[PDB]
A paper describes a structure:
Within the asymmetric unit of Rtms5Y67F there are 2 tetramers with 222 non-crystallographic symmetry which both match the biological unit predicted by analysis using PISA and the biological unit observed for Rtms5. The absorbance spectrum for Rtms5Y67F/H146S showed a single species (, 430 nm) whilst the absorbance spectrum for Rtms5Y67F showed two major species (, 440 nm and 513 nm) and a shoulder at ∼589 nm. The imidazole ring of His146 in Rtms5Y67F is rotated around Cβ towards the benzylidine ring and contributes to a significant increase in the non-coplanarity of the Rtms5Y67F chromophore compared to the Rtms5 chromophore. The average angle of 121° for the Cα2-Cβ2-Cγ2 bond in Rtms5Y67F is close to the ideal angle for this bond, compared to angles of 139° and 140° observed in Rtms5 and Rtms5H146S, respectively. The Nε2 of His146 forms a water-mediated H-bond with Oε1 of Glu215 through water molecule W1092. Notably, this water is within 2.1 Å of Cβ2 of the chromophore methine bridge. It is possible that the proximity of W1092 to the methine bridge contributes to the observed red-shift in the absorbance spectrum of Rtms5Y67F compared to that of Rtms5Y67F/H146S by coordinating increased electron pair density on the bridge of the chromophore. Rotation of the Ser69 side-chain and repositioning of the acylimine oxygen in Rtms5Y67F place them beyond hydrogen bonding distance suggesting a change in the charge associated with the acylimine oxygen.
The resulting proteins, Rtms5Y67F and Rtms5Y67F/H146S, have green fluorescence emission (, 508 nm), and are the first FPs reported that have both green emissions (500–525 nm) and a phenylalanine in the chromophore tripeptide. Each of the protomers in Rtms5Y67F and Rtms5Y67F/H146S consist of the same 11-stranded β-can motif typical of members of the GFP-superfamily of proteins. Located at the core of the barrel is the circularised tri-peptide QFG chromophore maintaining covalent links to Cys65 and Ser69 of the main-chain. The structures show evidence for the presence of an acylimine linkage extending the chromophore conjugation system that contributed to the green fluorescence emission.
Numbering used by the authors:
A (entry chain B), C (entry chain C), D (entry chain D): 5 to 65, 69 to 225
B (entry chain A): 6 to 65, 69 to 225
Write the structure that this text describes.
């Protein structure tokens, strides 16, 4: 509030393994935390070119940049300056599973995100390992308070080259490092776009819009 | 077309919850194109039910969903041949239900035949102890696959004394003939039990359902 | 051996739906409860010829016929004459789910099983709806006590025409209708064999051997 | 086939995160690969004392040490000298999920295991974060061949302080780095015993017996 300015930058440090292939990624992002608008530029710094779809990593690259209306408590923004962690499970319909963890901290006008990524049982002839994916559909996260924590669930879908969808379910648990005022039951609508990349996706630029709201029919 | 701006319907439901057998009959009406409907349910066999009415309320009407013109309406197109649905419900304490529906049309009246099977509800959990207080408004992600419409919802039952009891629905809609398939979209709903008797052997509920594109797109 | 004779008969009544297809089945069985051997003959009395693999129904057609060594409490036999129920979830690797409930009672020398079967989301071109299955691999149930109940889990596999397996996970909860002495952590090994059938599986004969044991390596 | 000696040593290097908490572990093992007997000494080298049950790490600390009968192809031993990887998903009954990967290689008389562990959504008041677990029951893996890989499934159970079990399912995929002769459907029975440890589990000694077999009732 005082803590988070209307324009902020951030830094992403991600490392992990997909089917045992190790990688590191660094990003530089910026956006407007109260408008729910952000952009980031990512470089694969280790283990590139990645032999799997960039798309599984794009949503691990920024929760404080969500536009919350005044009458819904904003759990993440409240968690600063101490900050918060998040823990994500991703269950893909062909049996692949990822677990992703983030620590999020603030230094002046900059957030820092440390992300560990672990994914496996992606089928070798499936669309992640053959790189046949073409972006996530726009998605919606169901959010509710439980034991001091914010719990989110999304039905996600990757568009497939040649048509059709490849489904994934996200469960993300957000954990503020102090007690904050808990929101009621609500949603966050997002779209995540890859707006630029080089040929082997060792460089990527992404755009996201995130807006909290009440249920549409209530 | 086939579907009038005002329609009634009849629900015949039967099934078992933790092995306890029941039948329910219902009388509904609403406006298919406005996504508004109301039903009165009677437990006709196996009442009073020793579990929460709320697990049955979402099984009692897909034609009554307001579709905008630029989103094909899968279900309404399936008439007069009609359609079936197959639902799985996975509750967070391990309970699972499988529910199947057949929907048909006779003039001005739909008929829904519903078979419900739920089990592994913990004897001391909120369903068996009747501690649930209705569903949160919910949202269904819908997409097309192999001529079928596949829906998924994160549902939540409100609990007496506070907190939620979670359930994930997967519902697959199967038109009995080919129809024009819609793109990726959502349906928002609110289901409210507006009346009931002391033991929930008689229940009235009201549902609003509205289709839309993604909000942020 | 005062409630359960060394030779018993049984009657099965099963009804249910698969992908909305309604059916009924009746069976006459016989066996040696203490030897863990049994045979049953089944007839599809309503809804036949069934448009799906008989194999999804075969395991639902008799727990009292399991050979328990003397030093492992036999939850199911102890429940008699009052009897017991079971509740089963079946999760198939292509997304199909079944839920099955049984009530088991005893009248003299005969058990009666009432079974309600509900299965759905079987892909139209998958192995069940296309009848491509060729019996169940021999299987093992992991069994432990909790809350006065016996809880069982099995990794099951259907053999496929042309090679390969089609996987299914079972979870079965056994509920004695009176309190009984609870067994420790143990296993039941079974093999279910279809030994005869007519061309459309409207008549089926099955044999099952079931023997309880302690962990092999302990 | 004597790339693998009758007595062998190994080195384990494990790193990972549990609920965001980073750790590293090193171990020194020895055993008899043809007898399915092995023991290992573990040291938490970074991030100790760990704020969670050692027990969730103990099964990530040795597949070549399984006794195979001659008439069951031994997928893992055949993989050497090229070796193999494995990818494991653990689903705990209270919603916790871990993803574990291993690379296994051989140099002379010594195996080297590199293991990456990612666990999260352990409830703060659950038995893992409150350290209420007292070892794994002996367990049994169902194994079959698929697409040149070996697929395994176990129903596991941790014993609890005060009585009761805390359940976990393991799905493990073994991937040989060259083609090998594939086994039919079979099981491996194991017991994993922590035979010594210090007060905060920063040092641990473990013993494992593993033996493959055909189905007991077939
Ligand atoms: Cl895989
Ligand atoms: Cl709370
Ligand atoms: Cl239960
Ligand atoms: Cl389609
Ligand atoms: Cl289907
Ligand atoms: Cl007990
Ligand atoms: Cl948690
Ligand atoms: Cl193979």
């Amino acid at each position: 509030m005082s803590v988070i300015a209307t324009q902020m930058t951030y830094k992403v440090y991600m490392s992990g393994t997909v089917n045992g292939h190790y990688f590191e990624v660094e990003g530089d992002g910026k956006g407007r935390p109260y408008e729910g608008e952000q952009t980031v530029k990512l470089t694969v710094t280790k283990g590139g070119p990645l032999p799997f779809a960039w798309d599984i990593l794009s949503p691990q690259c920024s929760i404080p940049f969500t536009k919350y209306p005044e009458d819904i408590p904003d759990y993440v923004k409240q968690s600063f300056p101490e900050g918060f962690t998040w823990e994500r499970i991703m269950n893909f319909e062909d049996g692949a599973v990822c677990t992703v963890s983030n620590d999020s901290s603030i230094q002046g006008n900059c957030f820092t995100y440390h992300v560990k990524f672990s994914g496996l049982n992606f089928p070798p002839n499936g669309p992640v390992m053959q790189k046949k994916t073409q972006g996530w559909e726009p998605h919606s996260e169901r959010l509710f308070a439980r034991g001091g924590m914010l719990i989110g669930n999304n039905f996600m879908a990757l568009k497939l080259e040649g048509g059709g969808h490849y489904l994934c379910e996200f469960k993300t648990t957000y954990k503020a490092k102090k007690p904050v005022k808990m929101p009621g039951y609500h949603y966050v609508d997002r779209k995540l776009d890859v707006t630029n990349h080089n040929k082997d996706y060792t460089s990527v630029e992404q755009c996201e819009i995130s807006i909290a709201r009440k249920p549409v029919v209530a």
